[PDB]
Amino acid sequence: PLESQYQVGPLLGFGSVYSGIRVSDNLPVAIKHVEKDRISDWGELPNGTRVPMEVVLLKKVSSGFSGVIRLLDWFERPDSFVLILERPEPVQDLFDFITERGALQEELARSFFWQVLEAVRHCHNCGVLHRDIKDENILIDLNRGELKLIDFGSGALLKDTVYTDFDGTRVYSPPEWIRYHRYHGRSAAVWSLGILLYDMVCGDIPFEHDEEIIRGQVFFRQRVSSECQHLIRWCLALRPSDRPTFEEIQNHPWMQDVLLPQETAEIHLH
Numbered sequence: 664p665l666e667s668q669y670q671v672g673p674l675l676g677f678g679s680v681y682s683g684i685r686v687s688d689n690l691p692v693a694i695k696h697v698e699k700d701r702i703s704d705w706g707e708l709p710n711g712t713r714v715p716m717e718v719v720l721l722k723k724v725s726s727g728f729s730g731v732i733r734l735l736d737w738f739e740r741p742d743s744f745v746l747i748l749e750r751p752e753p754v755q756d757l758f759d760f761i762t763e764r765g766a767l768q769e770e771l772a773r774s775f776f777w778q779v780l781e782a783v784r785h786c787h788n789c790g791v792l793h794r795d796i797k798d799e800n801i802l803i804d805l806n807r808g809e810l811k812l813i814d815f816g817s818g819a820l821l822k823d824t825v826y827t828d829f830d831g832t833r834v835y836s837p838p839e840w841i842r843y844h845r846y847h848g849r850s851a852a853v854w855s856l857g858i859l860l861y862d863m864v865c866g867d868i869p870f871e872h873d874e875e876i877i878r879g880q881v882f883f884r885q886r887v888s889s890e891c892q893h894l895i896r897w898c899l900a901l902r903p904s905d906r907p908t909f910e911e912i913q914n915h916p917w918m919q920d921v922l923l924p925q926e927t928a929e930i931h932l933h
């Protein structure tokens with residue numbers, strides 16, 4: 664069936680994502696392969712079929728909402744699974760985008776960061792915790808100026824209780840995980856968005872080493888507004904309880920008067 668519905672193009676960019684076309688309507692797709700031997704967390708669909716957690720998570724967050732990458736279909740194979748993902752065209756990941764432009768202007772960082780917050784909120788609303796929010800896991804739909812979360816491969820069902828496992832990016836991980844190998848989903852997510860926002864306005868992440876993470880001292884290597892500095896420092900509070908909630912972030916003075924995605928595209932992307 665797969666090869667009957669999708670024309671496979673070349674590799675894109677340890678992960679295995681190929682360019683693809685849906686032969687039905689020539690819709691651009693991405694084809695992610697995951698080998699069963701490499702899967703740590705297994706979920707179960709309503710039908711009680713054993714699938715990778717990523718399928719569960721993508722199925723739970725897959726609706727009208729443009730802020731998360733839509734899982735169009737998936738397949739079981741003897742030794743692997745194959746996820747069909749939407750592919751914007753043209754498209755750039757936020758890592759390559761920040762690398763090319765360096766530090767983003769606050770206005771564009773605000774629009775991008777707002778869109779990421781809206782997307783993370785949607786995930787949380789649908790019982791999904793991403794656990795690997797970072798520039799690489801954000802695609803820019805360059806025409807529409809819309810960001811899309813990708814890679815729920817380290818994700819989990821959202822729970823209000825302690826997490827004692829983590830398979831995400833260390834330099835984006837919060838001090839409580841480094842020190843005590845324990846975190847709560849939302850507060851840890853606010854940490855990673857702190858790192859992300861720092862990365863957007865400074866053109867690089869703030870911390871390389873465990874000691875730097877644990878100390879949580881933030882040096883700005885670029886001119887960044889006082890209000891943006893405050894929001895970053897707040898997201899990056901050492902004590903989880905001291906971190907802002909999603910509501911508190913989106914009500915922060917820095918987050919006000921956000922550009923519409925189309926506005927953002929017109930001004931900053933073309």
Ligand SMILES: NCC[C@H]1CN=C(O)c2cc(-c3cccc(OC(F)(F)F)c3)c(-c3ccccc3)n21
Nearest residue numbers: 675676678680693748749750751754756799813814
């Ligand atoms: N480091 C990022 C993580 C890699 C590995 N895990 C994943 O779950 C993943 C999914 C995709 C992806 C999703 C939708 C469209 C898509 O196509 C597009 F890039 F837009 F052309 C790719 C990529 C990926 C992104 C960008 C470049 C290469 C792969 N990834």
